[PDB]
Design a protein around this ligand. Structure first.
Ligand SMILES: Nc1ncnc2c1ncn2[C@@H]1O[C@H](COP(=O)(O)OP(=O)(O)O)[C@@H](O)[C@H]1O
Ligand SMILES: [Zn+2]
Lengths: 63, 283, 194, 144, 176, 438, 171
DNA sequence: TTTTTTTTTTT
């Protein structure tokens, strides 16, 4: 689970490939006796991957 | 590179450690463990390794290499700094230039790569150097995957006074060594791995002769010849005369095109006609 | 670098004769109401009534106009009406002057040769829209380097794209002098064919 | 306690001299101040974020890029408080409509080999990690 | 204009070199130079000092205003004042580029001179886009630029004048 | 690896007194042995401090293999060796190991208390400002450790003779986590530790405590050189010699033996250079009248193959499930993603449902499933070879019609199979003896 | 904000003032209420004082107090404006004071209201996360869904046409 | 937010 912030929000769409640089950390909202939850606070993100002149190859072909 | 991918590829620790046979690959593991280098830091790029390890790396490596029979581990070279992040050893510039000039994929006449390699020696072109360091890597990882072929298959024939080998097109990454200049280094590393590998006492002191196909249409191969290897070899090769006189005796078709004499292009059919007369000639 | 097209006079008293921008500008349609019959030519819209609403190019309605409104009278499109003249006062940095165009200041300055009543209120819209949209073209054009600017330029018109292409040509020319790059002699127009 | 702020006022000063001094390019061609220019060109556009690169930070001052790998929480704060003191001496005087200095979200990328989710052992708690994956969900933005 | 001609006009400033070759007076169409006594200073125009440095025939010298102390006071004077303050030379950007690129080893503390020059520049450019926004915002008809050098003018002039012409037009389209 | 194995029998041989002290009070002997093995390793490798600075000694095969239903109160806090299938596993959660708080009124960090797995640690009052209050953890100095909980239960046929199968909990700590998956057969070795629960006391009406095995060594019990194979393959006649090695009992059918042998090793999954994605999986579809050892052909291929799974057609994709332990509504794997590289043995192919039919065909020519379920929208991988057997309609295959009639299957599905073997029968005297005798 | 309403809440009163009474002292005390859904935002307690001073008892008077209405609807982004890759976003509106029943599920409204964040705390420890609502102060149905707005010129035309010919108006 | 049993409307 990640946690994006001010300018990292709405930057990626479900279905993307990414490369996260985050601070692996723990929730502090204070199965087992001393178990905590954990997330990755994201502070760096990446994504992996008509024209005027194109119009003429349509024009001449239609003509 | 990372500290791990550069031990597995230097053709001086890839020979001693015998990093082609699972039996001795654990030697590398033990060498790493004797220094306290986590197996997770050694696999990562060297510029990103933790700062607490790299303090005296160049000493804790020279030491723990005495305990393994590698006492010539520090050499004397020079290094250059330009600015904030620019730090080269004088044997990185060499491996990058030497691989910009001999790139496998050819894009024109013979003098199209020469220009691009002459370009990458001035500081105004650090974008070619920094690129010719990804070819020099790709080459070095595709050499230990050939010296691993001719030593887990025993394609080094003891044809008498000299060893002998040959290559197959079907093996991957064998069109890279088609050039008649990037073939001498492959052979000279093959000899260094071999002499360390074999158990005989005769083969350890015989020069090698190698042939690999040049042109499928003309049906011709390229042939080299390298001196008998040792630690203090005088480096005085003698095949420029042998091949000349052998082609003279058999009266076959040969080409001494280059400037050095020990590299020849030979018809695929005159191979044995040439080789037998050469065996007799060297005697 | 040496091909100096004839510029546009569509903002002054009268458009230039040879400027290919004004020629395509005036071609845009405009609504009129005819004052007489139109004999021998009712084929297009033979005669046409008087008091009929028609759509004609701007260049046509240049000579067909007189002070007395002899042949026809004109009424402005809604983009210059009272409706949109408040929208362009709320915040002019939001309007898509390419859909409402793509000649806003060019057209609007030729609708002043029709001596309508509200001219003293059109020549105040334009002035107060162009002044409103200035600090967003002075700063998104001198500060957008090696970026895909095809989205900073999607909501502009021909009088503003000409300035967004002059901010960039002076940014990309100082950044090419700082990097010792504007010393090498290069091919000027042949790299356009290539 | 009293040495805490005295260290910080000496880190927030060495993180500031990095943005203010780091250059690229050689001496033959010509140089380029890499992060002042991006601070200015991103502030004047109204973006408020730079993308610092860890190799640069390492090559300038080697100790800082190690702290940033070990204690990223309490050092990203000093970095983002120096980015705000540099973006002040670069864009000022702000013209008319803005005179309050905004806050600069310092992102950061790197060129290092990625780990994987199966290699997140608990000894990596509060250390910069770098993992690949595939986005599978997305909540709706909220306030904080 | 364009930066590569401001750089041409800036290569007329005088600097002081120390030659290491013998040569007698030269009578240039723009004055006189010499004589060149090996190991003795002489004052020449920049375009010659640079060209002799590249051919390994001289050794440059830092201009007097190029001191790491007076500059650290100009950099503060500029941020205090609220107008364009006077500058060491009318072409300081081009001097501190050409010199520090070609003779950075004959100038001590080059990489602090360079940062102070850039600090001054990055302010004198911020005052311009405020003095070029009040102009439009208030529809002036005149503006006294005090100590602008030709380079600041030329980096944002061909946009400012071209966007003020389109404003004069819009402001005088109702008279007739 | 920071984990050392100590076979118990040799400890008993070379040491008579420790191998008797051990399973009596193992919560401290296994702590002393840690500090012993440490000082040994830090002598054989003086730099190893840079690797985890802590060693755990496991213990291998105590001589007291036991059942999972015969654990009584006599074994509280005693080393124990057991066996049985594992039927759950949470995710690898991090647990506090050496906690360290910080006061909210003084900016001073409290003492490094250790965490015991029965009760939340309790810090006292701040010895610097006496500010007894709700402290919070200090994520930077605290030490964590991996954690995982599993539910082991008795083996199916081993001891569950005429009763229901019991179960137990186990807690795998740092180095052990992810040593076992649901379905594995393991054999724990761990302290049998109890702890007080307040719920059981409110259900049973008596003071009753819960129990859990703090596992100390997990050793799976499952299924895991060429110089012969050289000449054995160079026999030039390995075909006949291998055909009659599969189907070890069932007589006849050297016809279908051939096809199934072809299927087992597979083929070659070449990638076409025109972006057409040809598949390299052989799928088979048996068919024939009842009583001809089809199901046995399925069951033997369950054994001989590797990483195989099995199912009937009377669960095919991942589905939302409320976890037994964690009590969260997670997503669980189906039956076509557990053969992501091996084989999938379908049985009673006819009895599939319409949703099952519309879901099976997608994976044949695409080999990839999407799940936009209540959990979350994902797209996973499924590369399996399908081995199924249908039935003849009317209780007998009759070869007057085409096979596409007696199979009772949708027509574009049969195309997704490579081989179509038809099992048939006939009253034949000379084979009656052959099958009977067998 | 523009978009579709996709639910409504049950209209409920909400106090803004009480009026109490002392049967013993024959006085009359009042009390002004305020919650986080005002423009002033002070959380008052709805204790309904029964003994201001321990001596006298009180008794509420509902007829003289003041209540108001309160609803809560959920605008949701228009379908043909979503980027179609996600589940379109939503927002919570708090209608009030006779704006209440002005929107039914399935409409296309243009609410014009202040935007606000309303915090909370469960047990003296607040998560930073807040919930943001829109305190509407106008509503507009975008689509005109009737044609009664005939012009007087139109009704004139109509009364003309209905009189011109009574023979042939049906045909 | 899960099984299992039982009644009634619906495709
Ligand atoms: N040729 C044979 N050899 C050995 N066993 C056989 C043979 N034919 C039938 N059987 C017996 O029949 C059983 C298989 O029945 P099965 O094929 O599962 O029936 P159905 O197809 O109706 O499920 C096996 O358990 C086996 O004992
Ligand atoms: Zn305290």
């Amino acid at each position: 689970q990640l946690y994006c912030d001010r300018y990292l929000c709405d930057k990626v769409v479900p279905g993307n490939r990414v490369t996260i640089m985050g601070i692996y950390s723990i929730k502090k909202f204070g199965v087992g006796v001393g178990i905590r939850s954990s997330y990755i606070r994201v502070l760096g993100i990446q994504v992996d991957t008509v024209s005027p002149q194109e119009e003429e190859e349509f024009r001449r072909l239609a003509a | 590179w990372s500290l791990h991918d550069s031990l597995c590829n230097t053709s001086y620790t890839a020979a001693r450690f015998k990093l082609w046979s699972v039996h001795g690959q654990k030697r590398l593991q033990e060498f790493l463990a004797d220094m306290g280098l986590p197996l997770k830091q050694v696999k990562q790029k060297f510029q990103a390794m933790d700062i607490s390890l790299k303090e005296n790396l160049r000493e804790m490596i020279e030491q723990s290499a005495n305990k393994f029979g590698m006492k010539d581990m520090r050499v004397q070279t020079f290094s250059i700094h330009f600015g904030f992040k620019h730090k080269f050893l004088a044997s990185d510039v060499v491996f990058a230039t030497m691989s910009l000039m001999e790139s496998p994929e050819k894009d024109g006449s013979g003098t199209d790569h020469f220009i691009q390699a002459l370009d990458s020696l001035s500081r105004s072109n650090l974008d070619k150097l920094y690129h010719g360091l990804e070819l020099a890597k790709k080459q070095l990882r595709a050499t230990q995957q050939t010296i691993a072929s001719c030593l887990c298959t025993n394609l080094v024939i003891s044809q008498g006074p000299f060893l002998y080998c040959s290559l197959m097109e079907g093996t991957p990454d064998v069109m890279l060594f088609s050039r008649p200049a990037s073939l001498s280094l492959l052979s000279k590393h093959l000899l260094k791995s071999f002499v360390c590998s074999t158990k005989n006492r005769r083969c350890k002191l015989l020069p090698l002769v190698m042939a690999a196909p040049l042109s499928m249409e003309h049906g011709t191969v390229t042939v080299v010849g390298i001196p008998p290897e040792t630690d203090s070899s005088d480096r005085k090769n003698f095949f420029g005369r042998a091949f000349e006189k052998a082609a003279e005796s058999t009266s076959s078709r040969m080409l001494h095109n280059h400037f050095d004499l020990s590299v020849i292009e030979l018809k695929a059919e005159d191979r044995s006609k040439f080789l037998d007369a050469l065996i007799s000639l060297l005697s | 670098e040496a091909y100096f097209r004839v510029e546009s006079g569509a903002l002054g008293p009268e458009e230039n004769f040879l400027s290919l921008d004004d020629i395509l500008m005036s071609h845009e349609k405009l609504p009129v109401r005819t004052e007489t019959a139109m004999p021998r030519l009712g084929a297009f819209f033979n005669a046409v009534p008087q008091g009929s609403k028609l759509e004609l190019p701007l260049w046509l309605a240049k000579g067909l106009f007189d002070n007395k409104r002899r042949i026809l009278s004109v009424e402005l499109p809604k983009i210059y009406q009272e409706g949109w003249r408040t929208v362009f006062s709320a915040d002019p940095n939001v309007v898509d002057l390419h859909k409402m165009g793509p000649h806003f200041y060019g057209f609007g300055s030729q609708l002043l040769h029709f001596d309508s009543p509200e001219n003293a209120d059109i020549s105040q819209s334009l002035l107060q829209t162009f002044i409103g949209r200035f600090r967003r073209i002075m700063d998104s054009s001198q500060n957008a380097y090696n970026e895909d600017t095809s989205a900073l330029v999607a909501r502009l018109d021909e009088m503003e794209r000409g300035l967004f292409q002059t901010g960039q040509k002076g940014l990309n020319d100082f950044q090419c002098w700082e990097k010792g790059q504007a010393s090498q002699i290069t091919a000027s127009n042949l790299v356009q064919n290539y | 306690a009293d040495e805490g702020q005295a260290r910080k006022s000496q880190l927030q000063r060495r993180f500031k001299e990095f943005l203010r001094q780091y250059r690229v390019g050689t001496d033959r061609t010509g140089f380029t101040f890499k992060y002042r220019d991006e601070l200015k060109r991103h502030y004047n556009l109204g973006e408020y974020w730079i993308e610092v690169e860890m190799e640069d930070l390492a090559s300038f001052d080697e100790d800082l890029a190690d702290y940033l790998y070990k204690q990223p929480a309490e050092h990203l704060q000093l970095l983002e408080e120096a980015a705000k003191e540099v973006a002040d001496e670069v864009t000022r005087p702000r013209p008319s409509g803005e005179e309050v200095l905004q806050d600069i979200q310092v992102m950061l990328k790197s060129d290092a080999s990625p780990s994987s989710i199966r290699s997140l052992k608990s000894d990596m708690m509060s250390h910069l990690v770098k993992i690949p994956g595939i986005i599978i969900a997305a909540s709706a933005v909220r306030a904080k | 204009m364009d930066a590569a001609e401001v750089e041409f006009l800036a290569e007329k400033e005088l600097v002081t070199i120390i030659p290491n070759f013998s040569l007698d007076k030269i009578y240039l169409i723009g004055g006189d130079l010499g004589p060149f006594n090996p190991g003795l200073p002489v004052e020449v125009p920049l375009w010659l000092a640079i060209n002799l440095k590249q051919r390994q025939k001289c050794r440059l010298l830092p201009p007097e205003w190029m001191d790491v102390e007076k500059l650290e006071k100009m950099r503060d004077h500029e941020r205090k004042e609220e107008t364009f303050t006077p500058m060491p030379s009318p072409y300081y950007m081009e001097l501190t580029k050409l010199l520090l690129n070609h003779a950075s080893d004959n100038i001590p503390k080059a990489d602090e001179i360079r940062t102070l020059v850039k600090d001054m520049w990055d302010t004198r450019i911020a005052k311009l886009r405020v003095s070029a926004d009040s102009f439009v915002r208030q529809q002036e008809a005149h503006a006294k630029l005090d100590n602008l050098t030709l380079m600041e003018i030329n980096t944002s002039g061909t946009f400012l004048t071209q966007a003020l012409n389109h404003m004069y037009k819009l402001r005088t389209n109702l008279q007739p | 690896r920071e984990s050392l194995v100590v076979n118990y029998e040799d400890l008993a041989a070379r040491e008579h007194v420790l191998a008797y002290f051990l399973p009596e009070a193992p919560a401290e002997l296994l702590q002393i042995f840690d500090e012993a093995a440490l000082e040994v390793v830090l002598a054989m490798y003086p730099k190893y401090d840079r690797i985890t600075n802590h060693i755990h000694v496991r213990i291998s095969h105590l001589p007291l293999v036991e059942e999972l239903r015969s654990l009584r109160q006599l074994h509280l806090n005693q080393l124990i060796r057991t066996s049985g299938v594992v039927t759950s596993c949470t995710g690898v959660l991090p647990q506090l190991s050496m906690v360290k708080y910080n006061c909210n009124k003084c900016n001073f960090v409290l003492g490094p208390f250790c965490q015991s797995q029965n009760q939340e640690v309790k810090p006292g009052s701040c010895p610097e400002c006496q500010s007894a209050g709700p402290f919070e953890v200090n994520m930077e100095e605290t030490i964590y450790q991996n954690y995982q909980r599993i539910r082991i239960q008795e083996s199916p046929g081993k001891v569950a003779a005429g009763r229901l199968p019991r179960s137990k909990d186990a807690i795998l700590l740092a180095d052990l986590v992810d040593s076992c998956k649901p379905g594995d057969e393991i054999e724990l070795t761990g302290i049998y530790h109890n702890n007080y629960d307040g719920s059981l006391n409110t259900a049973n009406g008596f003071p009753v405590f819960a129990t859990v095995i703090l596992a100390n060594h997990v050793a799976k019990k499952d299924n895991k050189d060429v110089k012969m194979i050289t000449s054995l393959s160079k026999d030039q006649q390995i075909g006949e010699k291998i055909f009659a090695s599969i189907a070890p009992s069932i007589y006849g059918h050297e016809d279908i033996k051939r096809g199934l042998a072809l299927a087992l090793f597979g083929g070659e999954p070449k990638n076409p250079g025109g972006k057409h994605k040809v598949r390299g999986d052989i799928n088979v579809l048996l068919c024939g009248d009842p009583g001809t050892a089809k199901s046995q052909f399925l069951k033997y291929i369950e054994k001989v193959s590797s990483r195989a799974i099995f199912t009937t057609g009377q669960g095919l994709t991942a589905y939302v499930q409320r976890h037994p332990v964690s009590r969260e509504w997670t997503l669980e794997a189906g039956a076509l993603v557990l053969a992501d590289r091996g084989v999938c043995l379908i049985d009673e192919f006819d009895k599939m449902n319409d949703q099952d039919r519309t879901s099976i065909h997608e994976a044949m020519e695409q080999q990839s499933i999407s799940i936009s379920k209540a959990g979350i929208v994902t797209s996973l991988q499924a590369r399996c070879t399908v081995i199924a057997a249908a039935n003849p309609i009317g209780g007998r295959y009759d070869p007057s019609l085409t096979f596409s009639e007696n199979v009772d299957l949708t027509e574009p599905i049969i195309s997704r199979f490579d081989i179509l073997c038809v099992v048939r029968d006939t009253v034949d005297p000379v084979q009656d003896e052959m099958l009977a005798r067998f | 904000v523009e978009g579709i309403v996709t639910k409504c809440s049950l209209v409920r009163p909400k106090v803004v003032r009480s009026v109490h009474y002392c049967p013993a002292t024959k006085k009359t005390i009042e009390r002004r209420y305020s919650d986080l859904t005002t423009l002033v935002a002070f959380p008052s307690s709805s204790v309904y004082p029964t003994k201001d001073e321990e001596n006298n008892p009180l008794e509420t008077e509902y007829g003289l107090s003041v209540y108001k209405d309160h609803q809560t609807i959920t605008i949701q982004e228009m379908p043909e404006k979503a980027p179609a890759g996600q589940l379109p976003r939503s927002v919570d509106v708090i209608l009030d004071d006779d704006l209440v029943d002005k929107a039914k599920p399935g409409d296309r409204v243009q609410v014009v209201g202040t935007y606000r964040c309303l915090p909370g705390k469960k047990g003296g420890y607040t998560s930073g996360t807040f919930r943001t609502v829109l305190i509407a102060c106008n509503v507009k149905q975008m689509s005109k869904d009737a044609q009664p707005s005939f012009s007087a010129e139109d009704i004139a035309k109509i009364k003309k046409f209905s009189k011109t010919r009574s023979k042939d108006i049906f045909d």
